[PDB]
Amino acid sequence: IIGGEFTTIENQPWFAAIYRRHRGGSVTYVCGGSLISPCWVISATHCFIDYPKKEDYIVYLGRSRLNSNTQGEMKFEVENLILHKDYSADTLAHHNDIALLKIRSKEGRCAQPSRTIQTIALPSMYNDPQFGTSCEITGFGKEQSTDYLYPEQLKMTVVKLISHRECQQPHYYGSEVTTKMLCAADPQWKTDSCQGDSGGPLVCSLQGRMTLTGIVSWGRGCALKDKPGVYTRVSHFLPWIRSHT
Numbered sequence: 227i228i229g230g231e232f233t234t235i236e237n238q239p240w241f242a243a244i245y246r247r248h249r250g251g252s253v254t255y256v257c258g259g260s261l262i263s264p265c266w267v268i269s270a271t272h273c274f275i276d277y278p279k280k281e282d283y284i285v286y287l288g289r290s291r292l293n294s295n296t297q298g299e300m301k302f303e304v305e306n307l308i309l310h311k312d313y314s315a316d317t318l319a320h321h322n323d324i325a326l327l328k329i330r331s332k333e334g335r336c337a338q339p340s341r342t343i344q345t346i347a348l349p350s351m352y353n354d355p356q357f358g359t360s361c362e363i364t365g366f367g368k369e370q371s372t373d374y375l376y377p378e379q380l381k382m383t384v385v386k387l388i389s390h391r392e393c394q395q396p397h398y399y400g401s402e403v404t405t406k407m408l409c410a411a412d413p414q415w416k417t418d419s420c421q422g423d424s425g426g427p428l429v430c431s432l433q434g435r436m437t438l439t440g441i442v443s444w445g446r447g448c449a450l451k452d453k454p455g456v457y458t459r460v461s462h463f464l465p466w467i468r469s470h471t
């Protein structure tokens with residue numbers, strides 16, 4: 227997250243921290259995700275496509291820090307890694323960038339909700355907020371494009387939804403953006419998602435309900451003028467989510 231503010235897991239208790247085990251046994255951070263039910267985390271396919279083996283991954287819930295344990299956290303293995311069959315990557319833009327992780331502890335259990343662990347509601351189909359609506363994004367991704375390290379403490383910020391028409395403009399993204407993607411940015415381009423925020427939540431308040439509107443997917447640079455963050459439009463994937471869960 228470029229700009230914004232540090233936070234803790236109580237302010238985004240559906241946030242899932244996803245790591246990969248290496249040959250040799252070191253564990254590194256991969257991507258964010260969101261808990262949509264006790265046994266299911268939703269994320270982005272591009273996070274996993276290079277290493278598509280479920281046994282390589284570890285999922286934490288209730289975690290506020292990157293490389294230290296948070297009190298009350300839960301650790302899970304990935305019992306099921308489901309990537310979207312129609313995923314594609316061009317140079318920047320990832321199509322159908324959505325993935326499901328079925329989680330299960332070494333004791334064979336799913337998430338027990340707590341003060342630090344809760345689910346996030348999915349939107350109703352094809353129902354998103356209007357352009358200019360302020361939404362929030364959360365993650366352990368880079369604080370500056372030039373940074374080598376990821377922040378040790380969770381961050382979040384606010385961005386505003388951009389219309390498909392505006393994001394479709396050539397000075398923005400041209401036809402790289404489809405109707406299954408959502409664009410969002412700061413009016414000053416001051417704050418944004420970045421590398422390492424992929425897979426994490428874009429949350430909007432719809433009709434009084436906090437709703438998983440987007441999944442962090444891609445962008446050209448981070449917090450660059452005329453280059454918004456691009457998000458998988460969750461309300462266009464409800465059948466795929468339902469069928470696979």
Ligand SMILES: N=C(N)NC(=O)c1nc(-c2ccoc2)c(N2CCCCCC2)nc1N
Pocket residue numbers: 371418419420421422423424442443444445446447448449450453454455456
């Ligand atoms: N909202 C944005 N403006 N940007 C992002 O959300 C975002 N940005 C980058 C990025 C762009 C230039 O440096 C890093 C990124 N990457 C990691 C993936 C592996 C190839 C490198 C790109 N993933 C992202 N999800």
